[PDB]
Amino acid sequence: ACGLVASNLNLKPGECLRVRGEVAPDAKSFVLNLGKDSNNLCLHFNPRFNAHGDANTIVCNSKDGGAWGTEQREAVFPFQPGSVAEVCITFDQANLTVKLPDGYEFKFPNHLNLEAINYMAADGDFKIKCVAFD
Amino acid sequence: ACGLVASNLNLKPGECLRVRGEVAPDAKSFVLNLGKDSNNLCLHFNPRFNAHGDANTIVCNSKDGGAWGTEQREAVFPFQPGSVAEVCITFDQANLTVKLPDGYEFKFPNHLNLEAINYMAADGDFKIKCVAFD
């Protein structure tokens, strides 16, 4: 029961990927994967409301050659179940910059040093309503 | 490989799929494919500015199990090279409807009778900049 999957995004550095979606009223978690393909993700965005013992916490990671990297969590959680949310993503050689709903912003190291983001896959309790490329 | 490819769209009857893109300045033609998957297309939207023996003419067709159906040709050609084009697509038991802001709208028989559009692909001189679902 997965969601949107888009390839050939060809998102270059500095370019902004904007994703707007509807967070389910009883959402437990949702995921946005970005990278080259399903085995090579420069970013695994997985805001968790309550799903893996975790409660209202944003979990980030990367996957290189099928291998998950060292997980990373953010303190803030600007996501409300039953509400519409937008996340804006960009990157450079050193970091991916993720801009969340209430202005909050954070960087995730660009572990794969990807030339461009060509793959995106959404999953979970987040119904994509709009996706804008640069 | 080509332009943006998106799957798992899960567009249902009546729901509007809006696509905004940039037509290349040297646009010879561009394609918007909609269907179940790459081999099952309820709509192959192909405006041809100057491709094949065609000039400034829209060609539409379907694809069933990999086999192309019979093409349909339009007289109206509301497209221009090096410009932003916007299309609004929907469907029902009878036809697929492609609308433009100018007021132009094309109808193509729903040959496959699919009850959902899960696949969308862009090819040619059309770069997708935004896609909105329902």
**Domain range annotation of chain A:** 1-134
B-chain CB neighbours of A84 within 8 Å are none
> Which are the contacts of B100, defined by CB distance < 8 A and separation ≥ 6?
B78, B85, B86, B87, B88
Distance (Å) from the alpha carbon of B130 to chain A's nearest alpha carbon: 4
| DSSP state for residue A41 in the 8-state scheme | E
For residue B68, give the H/E element and its range.
strand B67-68
Contact predicate B54/B71, CB 8 Å: no
Contact residues, chain B to chain A, C-beta under 8 Å: 1-9, 128-134
Cα(A17)–Cα(A34) distance, rounded to whole angstroms?
10
Q: Residue B118's closest chain A neighbor by CA?
A: A4
What tokens were used for A87?
């996340």
Q: Establish whether B10 is an annotated binding residue.
A: no
Cα(A106)–Cα(A95) distance, rounded to whole angstroms?
10
Q: Compute the radius of gyration of chain B from its Cα atoms.
A: 14
Cα(A42)–Cα(A69) distance, rounded to whole angstroms?
10
**3-state secondary structure (DSSP) of residue B97:** strand
N-term to C-term CA, chain B: 28
| DSSP state for residue B29 in the 8-state scheme | B
Map tokens 């949702």 to a residue.
A30
Amino acid residing at A98: V
User: Which is nearest to B101 in space by CA: B89, B91, B87?
Assistant: B87
Q: Establish whether B111 is an annotated binding residue.
A: no
Q: Which of B9, B130, B134 has the CB atom closest to A133's CB atom? A: B130
Strands A95-99, B30-37: pairing is unpaired
Cα(B76)–Cα(B103) distance, rounded to whole angstroms?
11
Q: Establish whether A101 is an annotated binding residue.
A: no
User: Which is nearest to A3 in space by CA: A13, A106, A24, A104?
Assistant: A24
Cα(B93)–Cα(B97) distance, rounded to whole angstroms?
11
Q: Which of B3, B7, B131 has the CB atom closest to A5's CB atom? A: B7
User: Which is nearest to B94 in space by CA: B38, B13, B12, B32?
Assistant: B13
CATH code given to domain B1-134: 2.60.120.200
Cα(B104)–Cα(B106) distance, rounded to whole angstroms?
7
**3-state secondary structure (DSSP) of residue B49:** strand
Q: Do B8 and A5 touch (CB under 8 A)?
A: yes
Q: How far is CA B103 from CA A56, A118, B99, in A?
A: 46, 34, 7
> Which are the contacts of A53, defined by CB distance < 8 A and separation ≥ 6?
none
Cα(B131)–Cα(B116) distance, rounded to whole angstroms?
17
Q: How many residues does chain A have?
A: 134
> Which are the contacts of A5, defined by CB distance < 8 A and separation ≥ 6?
A119, A120, A121, A122, B6, B7, B8
User: Which is nearest to B2 in space by CA: A7, A41, A35, A33?
Assistant: A7
Map tokens 């960087």 to a residue.
A107
User: Which is nearest to B6 in space by CA: A121, A1, A13?
Assistant: A121
B-chain CB neighbours of A132 within 8 Å are 129-131
Strands B117-124, B126-133: pairing is unpaired
Experimental method reported for this structure:
X-ray
